[PDB]
Design a protein around this ligand. Structure first.
Ligand SMILES: Nc1ncnc2c1ncn2[C@@H]1O[C@H](COP(=O)(O)OP(=O)(O)NP(=O)(O)O)[C@@H](O)[C@H]1O
Ligand SMILES: [Mg+2]
Lengths: 51, 48, 452, 587, 344, 389, 116
């Protein structure tokens, strides 16, 4: 019975904490990497036009 | 709530791998939980 | 008439040797082949005007084309005759009916209501949908959006409210203005067929912009609709309901225009001014002190990847006065409409409910059904995670409450109109499921009169 | 017409020419002495900024820029059918002959169609007849299959003064018309810009199901004529076969096949394999009703971006004839890659993942040009374009921009799955992931035409496949021998739907195509079997006994797909057998 | 040195099997005459050794006709370039070869020239001399690096991830200069080698290259660090034209079936390994323990042949069977019983 | 800015002795090779370079402090004359251009150092050049580029950044110098790289990795737990690894190559395990795998971890490195054989507490007393042989 | 001004000097303002390419000189934007100074003082 509870807690810690956090962090970083790429092209266009 | 990590290309690749692992581990932990449970039911009836 | 185009650089065109040209002025380009293209002045300096052309700049010869400045911004020719008619995104007839004789021409940016002249939203619009009317009531003058997603039935709900919505105890001084933004021909046909078949079109104006219409026309569309709305409401004293879909499409077009000018992009590549731009639409909703009539808005949008933190739903939520949320979980359950009352809220609801408006039992039943459903849902959540056994007998009752609420109250079908009386009464029936001792948000006087 | 300017700057792909005031924006031009392809993006006073799509190596200032006078266009006329083109309509066959070379030599200019060839033009309209765009003034039997109708081109309104049958080239005057601008001469060909949609009287709902004869598509995820379908194509999932099947078996008159920016060796296959495909009705080569566009990845980026646009325009011309056309694009992900490159080369502000901000619009523009319509002309004849696109998502991940933006504007999605392919299940369409938003409408149509509850049968077969995925979870945990007698029946039906119905070998003589009628009888025996067998369980008979008893008949069900179309009676008779056998087992 | 676009209707389908002598390629990711099959590697990964091996061992079977090997080094170190030159000299591989050796301290412009010099030479030998040519180019990431350098010189704004908008046209142009032409005796086969920065297959170089070429062979440090040589990961590797080069008459009749089976059994083996960690020794089926041992032997004996071991297709096939023989006949579901009875 | 000419460039085949266990075993640099140490701040790039300057068996050391701390340079001038290898300062040259000295002089320093190094190379000497750090040099190029209003490459650096780096490293290496004597001389380049935020997708690290053959990637997470040198054994590599194994096998007259492969193989398995473990593991792990984690732990703590500032642990001879690693692998081997005879993990561990302490403390054994290490091998075998019965 | 005062007190008046400057993040924000106003080529986040160099011209003004009895000990303080130590201010600052003492929100909420 105890070992059942021990497995339940791990399943649950994965389903309700670890997997969500991973999933949410992954989506966040994709977005951030995307903003940075956009920021760079904005600055490169301005740089080019100092000419 | 997201984890405290730095938004680098390598971090993304790490977490994506860590996530595929996490997912698979979760299914296998569910599988065991269910096995132990039906083995538990047999024994708990004996106990009773 | 100017034969002086100096530059064409993608979307933008430079006209030199101009005089008396003003910011945001409407222009006409008469091309070398006799084609006509409209446009707007973005920037005017010394003797130079930067204009942008709606239909684009392809096919243009600079030498042989000419520019006409019209001395006025983009306008709509408005009329009472617009009721029953179908227009495109620029107020041009689409329905093969007569030309419109306008009473006047109005600048489509409209004007800002003096906050002191503004009248707080008051009074009830019966959508005929229970989960809106009872728990998330629409009030005359309010802005209440629908947040949906891909493959969710927001069009069905949009159509249902459009035909069902009414004001009680007064006719006929109620209009619906329908704006379709960047939608496909088939979506556009569904809406148009429905309005015709149910007879809704008799009390509506339609502005239809399609996915393959030019981007600038797309952002023109809601403004054209709001202008027609304000006219009907303030000049002709109507209560007007303005339904716009899909506002995500609107944003993309705004984003498309922004990137073409290489402006600095905001979160997720949308314009930095996305918030302001959407506000210029949604703040046209309201009542004015001393004028009969109101403009009420239901913007409908799809949340990208189901994410409410996305700039479109997030900024729209920062402007509007509540939100109605459609969810996948509910949709897979055959709940029509798949409204989730928990994330949903109408901020202004009490100005449109109570004795004289709906019924005296309204607010108390709402607080109670909501609380029961929240407790019910929490019990279901417990049964899934830990099994039936973790629940008190009372939890089970609540869990069963949540399930009937979903299946019998919220789920009404997309063709069923519920009067506010039918809705409230049904609320009382689901309440009977619970021990009277449980109904703590409702006082004894109401329990005595209504509790079945 | 042709306009000559002078190059003042050469910088990589960018060329600048002066004295181009007669030129316009988006015009195509030939750059340099050599004459490689370019497009005018910008114009300042008389200075044009030109994107060059071939190597500019060895071009310098002082050399000409020759302007075509127009934006990218297609020649539309007799000689189009059965030809293979690239994205800007360069005729691959003619390249080989005139050129006597194995290369698409740069600077080499050749008209898309044969302007020297003789055609018999049969006049069918009479002198003194009033005409407008779309009216058919005659026809030419262009191939062994297709009749090429000669329509009054857009922009012409008048009366037919002179017309005669006889043998003309596509450049000969074949008709005289009295316009408002005096008399005008018509020839058998018309030019249209690939970016301008060909005009129509009115657009209609596409509510008639296209019969592909592929059981999984027609039944579960139907497309209508004028509809659109998206098909991800991972490697190894029999995508080409599936496309071949639709290419030959669908009830459309013409096929346009577009290859957007394909791998050299992958593209070699289509070029070889398409002509090998045979028309079922005439047994002639399928190319007899196909126009084929082929770009390899190293073709001009212009050509690779224009590919689908070029193909859809040709599709429209035949649509305008009152034909039903099918446009097949492989791969739109690659077309999108051309756009992504162009956005970089134009120093644009990027949209999502590097694609332009107008990617969604560009895609909406494409798809909205397909559909059921009433064409221009007095006839008010109908025609349609049905669009079938492959996407090749970078990770087989559906979530990326191209696929997501397509799914905004098309209603059918057929998910090819390599894991199904690995189990030997073809077509390898994932029946849980896939969908058709024409399903309801098609079923309404089908109930009408059959006078049967076809839509109830489909819903039911799908409910069983969905129940199967839930039951498989249990089979994994508790083993197959722990399921109830009822659940075990469901596994058997679902299994039947999977092996008896969904699986279809393209290369078999009879299994290659299934009529609507046969599809109905095939599905009915399976559901009937499930129905009668559920009854018997309800009456205390055991699952294993029903299985052991129904061996011969379940075999008859598994041969259903092979029963010749001519002899449908033999499938229908199985219903009586199921009931006779089952009741007998209940004894 | 730019070359020309081949009219598509002029191309011939790749017919011939090429024996690289590396089981992981020959069996599971077959290279065929006229294919473009790249190697995707990383910094500190032995693509140097792999490239040298392929260049020593590359051969067509039962042809007495011999491979001309055109080798291009793009911006590589002296130490790497000398290794390649000594290897070619040491084994006499130079007698068939033409080498274009560009160094890292050579100008960027020369570095961009190198691949084009080498492909012009190959097309000359293939389509003028009728030879069968195999072109090996490393490192392609160094070439993209030089493209950036010239791109900035002209003040051009980068496209995706810092690279020119026209990178795809540039890479496509290079890689499509390979294949068979109808009515011409000879052929060019390309194996471009590139390093994926920070091991990122999403990176524009490997990502854009993957669209252009017909599959890819992928080396991984996971494999390399356990001493697997060559460290090829079969699972993400792919040859898009393998079928055209295999079976009866070209290799052996059992080629495809075994490839499909080894591929699955290895996938299953790795899963079984995981299960071992998560649920423990005991939860493993005896059939499961075998898959575990199979995946272990498959990495250690089949994939790990060593950088100087040339296996014939027949030895490779035989070793696969030997490895498949660990399993019960009941498990080899993707092989016709016809073949099970012939090869064990 | 001109490379001094030479007769011939050669392949560097002789391993440098750094005396740092992790480098010499798993990621060795040969004499005439080029290595990079990219790491975030505080990870130990500077200390790694001090160790090589101090202990390596080159003839001459040129230390170029490029855009760094003033104190670090005064540390070297002051501490080096007090050291031996004969004073250490007597084989040492120092170029110092600190962080707050003029920016453009950072480039000048890298160049004057390698040129001074080449000069001594021509004389037939073995020269190690430390550039610390090359990021400041690149960042000086970034400053000028920005001031000139050039079009940047990635992250703001000039587009020719890669070509500049390649010029520098290609100047390093083992050679035949000009002259009839035909002398051999080497230049070994050891470079520090300082990527912003420790992110190595950046241009300076990426471009360096393409021209060097050794990568010693430092990990901030290893530094925080004070595991030094904080080299990521999974991420780091040495292209000289295979050639060096051969040289070491011959010298030690043992199978060193094989030991090292098994060492890394175990470390790589540990990684594989820890992934799955950090979510469910330990409780349910097989004994074979439990053992594996212990051998990996012994490697990490007993061998990999080495403190620069300890009197004894500051340097390890090859004879000493070999003996420590043998003792560690012998444990894993003997324990592995016992598990296969029926013994239990718990039995073995509880029964080997004393011997495992000895293995752990062998890093501290003096070079004069190596028998005190090699004698642990007998105790392992006896102890475990005993537990089975 | 402050470091000129400190270097004077220490090396010219022979005192042991403790220099505490806060908050350095504001200093770097000012450099960006000028950097942006000059429209120089921006680095990361708009920070100038010379941020490292500029910072080092402050932090390297600390220490001790042979034969002079005074000293300068610098304890600069900065708040890390978004609590992110990879942000250019803490990153570059960390690459210049001789260590760093870090305070964390977690330790602070747990009642640990100082929350190092
Ligand atoms: N091998 C080692 N043994 C003992 N202590 C060490 C070792 N490496 C680093 N440390 C400790 O960590 C501190 C930082 O090392 P250091 O070499 O200065 O880092 P760094 O990477 O050069 N930082 P930066 O110069 O800002 O990039 C040293 O002062 C030591 O206290
Ligand atoms: Mg340091």
């Amino acid at each position: 019975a105890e070992e059942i509870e021990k497995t339940r807690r791990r399943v649950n810690a994965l389903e309700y904490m670890t997997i969500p956090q991973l999933e949410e962090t992954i989506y966040y970083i994709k977005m951030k990497l995307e903003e940075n790429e956009r920021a760079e092209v904005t600055r490169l266009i301005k740089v080019k036009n100092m000419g | 709530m997201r984890l405290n990590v730095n938004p680098t290309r390598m971090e993304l690749t790490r977490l994506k791998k860590q996530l595929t692992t996490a997912t698979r581990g979760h299914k296998l932990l569910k599988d065991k939980q269910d096995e132990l449970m039906r083995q538990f039911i047999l024994l708990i009836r004996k106990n009773n | 008439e100017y034969r002086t185009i100096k530059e064409v650089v993608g979307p933008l065109m430079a006209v030199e040797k101009v005089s008396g040209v003003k910011y945001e002025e409407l222009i006409e380009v008469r091309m070398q082949n006799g084609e006509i293209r409209r446009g707007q002045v973005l920037e005017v300096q010394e003797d130079k005007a930067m204009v942008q052309i709606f239909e684009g700049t392809s096919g243009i010869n600079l030498k042989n084309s000419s520019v006409r400045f019209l001395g006025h911004p983009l306008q709509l020719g408005v009329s009472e005759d617009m009721i029953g008619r179908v227009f495109d995104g620029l107020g041009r007839p689409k329905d093969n009916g007569p030309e419109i004789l306008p009473e006047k021409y109005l600048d489509i940016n409209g004007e800002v209501i003096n906050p002191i002249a503004r009248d707080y939203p008051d009074e009830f619009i019966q959508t005929g949908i229970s989960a809106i009317d009872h728990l998330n009531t629409l009030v005359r003058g309010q802005k209440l959006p629908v947040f949906s997603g891909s493959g969710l039935p927001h069009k069905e709900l949009a159509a249902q409210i459009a035909r069902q919505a009414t004001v009680l105890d007064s006719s006929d001084d109620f209009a619906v203005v329908f704006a379709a933004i960047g939608i496909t021909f088939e979506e556009a046909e569904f809406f148009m067929e429905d309005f015709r078949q149910t007879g809704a079109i008799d009390r509506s104006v339609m502005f239809m912009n399609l996915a393959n219409d030019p981007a600038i026309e797309r952002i023109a569309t809601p403004r054209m609709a709001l202008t027609a709305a304000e006219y009907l409401a303030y000049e002709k004293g109507m209560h007007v309901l303005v339904i716009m879909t899909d506002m995500t499409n609107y944003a993309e077009a705004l984003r498309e225009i922004s990137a073409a000018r290489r402006e600095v992009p905001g979160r997720r590549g949308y314009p930095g001014y996305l918030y302001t731009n959407l506000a210029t639409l949604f703040e046209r909703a309201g009542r004015i002190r001393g004028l009969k009539g109101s403009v009420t808005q239901i913007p409908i949008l799809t949340m990208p990847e189901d994410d409410k933190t996305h700039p479109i739903p997030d900024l729209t939520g920062y402007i509007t006065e509540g939100q109605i949320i459609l969810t996948r979980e509910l949709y897979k359950s055959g709940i029509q409409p798949p409204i989730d009352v928990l994330p949903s809220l109408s901020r202004l609801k009490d100005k449109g409910t109570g004795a004289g408006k709906t019924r005296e039992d309204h607010a108390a039943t709402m607080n109670q059904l909501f609380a029961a459903y929240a407790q019910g849902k929490q019990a279901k959540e417990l049964a899934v995670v830990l099994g039936e056994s973790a629940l008190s007998d009372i939890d089970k009752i609540y869990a069963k409450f949540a399930e009937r609420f979903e299946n019998e109250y919220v789920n009404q079908g997309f063709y069923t109109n519920r009067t506010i009386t039918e809705t409230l009464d049904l609320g009382w029936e689901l309440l009977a499921m619970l021990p009277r001792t449980e109904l703590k948000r409702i006082k004894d006087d109401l329990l005595d009169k209504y509790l079945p | 017409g042709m306009q000559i300017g002078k190059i003042i700057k050469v910088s990589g792909p960018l060329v600048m020419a002066e004295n181009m005031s007669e030129a316009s924006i988006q015009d195509m031009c030939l750059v340099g002495d050599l004459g490689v392809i370019g497009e005018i993006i910008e114009m300042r006073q008389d200075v044009a900024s030109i994107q060059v799509y071939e190597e500019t190596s060895g071009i310098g200032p002082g050399e000409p820029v020759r302007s075509t006078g127009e934006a990218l266009s297609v020649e539309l006329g007799p000689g189009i059918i059965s030809q293979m083109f690239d994205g800007i309509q360069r005729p691959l066959d003619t390249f080989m002959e005139v050129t006597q070379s194995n290369f698409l030599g740069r600077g080499v200019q050749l008209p898309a169609l044969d302007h020297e060839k003789q055609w018999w033009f049969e006049a069918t309209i009479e002198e003194g007849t009033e005409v407008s765009a779309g009216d058919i003034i005659g026809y030419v039997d262009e191939t062994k299959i297709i009749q090429h109708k000669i329509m009054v081109p857009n922009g012409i309104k008048g009366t037919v003064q002179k017309i005669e049958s006889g043998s003309f080239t596509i450049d000969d005057p074949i008709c005289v018309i009295e316009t408002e601008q005096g008399l005008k001469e018509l020839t058998m060909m018309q030019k249209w810009p690939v970016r301008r949609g060909r005009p129509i009287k009115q657009k209609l709902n596409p509510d008639v199901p296209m019969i592909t004869g592929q059981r999984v598509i027609d039944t579960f995820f139907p497309v209508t004529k004028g509809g659109a379908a998206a098909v991800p194509g991972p490697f190894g999932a029999g995508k080409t076969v599936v496309q071949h099947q639709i290419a030959k078996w669908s009830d459309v008159d013409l096929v346009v096949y577009v290859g957007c920016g394909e791998r050299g060796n992958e593209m070699t296959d289509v070029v070889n394999e398409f002509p090998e495909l045979i028309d079922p009705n005439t047994g002639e080569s399928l190319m007899e009703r196909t126009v084929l566009i082929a770009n390899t990845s190293n073709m001009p980026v212009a050509a690779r971006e224009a590919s689908i646009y070029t193909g859809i325009t040709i599709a429209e011309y035949f649509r305008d004839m009152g034909y039903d056309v099918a446009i097949m694009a492989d791969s739109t992900s690659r077309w999108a890659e051309a756009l992504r490159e162009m956005s970089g080369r134009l120093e644009e502000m990027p949209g999502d993942e590097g694609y332009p901000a107008y990617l969604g619009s560009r895609l909406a523009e494409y798809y909205e040009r397909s559909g059921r319509v009433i064409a221009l002309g007095s006839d008010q004849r109908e025609g349609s374009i049905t669009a079938i696109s492959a996407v090749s998502p970078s990770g087989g991940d559906i979530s990326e921009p191209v696929t997501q933006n397509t799914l905004r504007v098309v209603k059918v999605f057929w998910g090819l799955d390599s894991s199904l392919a690995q189990k030997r299940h073809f077509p390898s369409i994932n029946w849980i992931q896939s969908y058709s938003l024409y399903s309801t409408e098609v079923g309404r149509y089908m109930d009408q035409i059959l006078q049967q509850d076809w839509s109830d049968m489909v819903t039911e077969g799908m409910r069983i496949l969905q129940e199967e995925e839930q039951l498989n979870e249990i089979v994994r945990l508790v083993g197959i021998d722990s399921l109830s007698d009822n659940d075990r029946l469901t596994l058997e039906v679902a299994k039947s739907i999977r092996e008896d119905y969904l699986q279809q070998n393209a290369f078999d003589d009879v299994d290659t195509f299934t009529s609507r009628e046969k599809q109905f009888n095939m599905l009915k025996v399976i559901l009937t079997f499930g129905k009668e067998a559920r009854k018997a369980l309800s009456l205390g008979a055991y699952f294993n006994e029903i299985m052991e008893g129904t061996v011969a008949v379940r075999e008859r069900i598994s041969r259903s797909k092979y029963i010749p179309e001519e002899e449908l009676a033999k499938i229908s008779s199985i219903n009586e057998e199921i009931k006779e056998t089952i009741q007998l087992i209940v004894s």
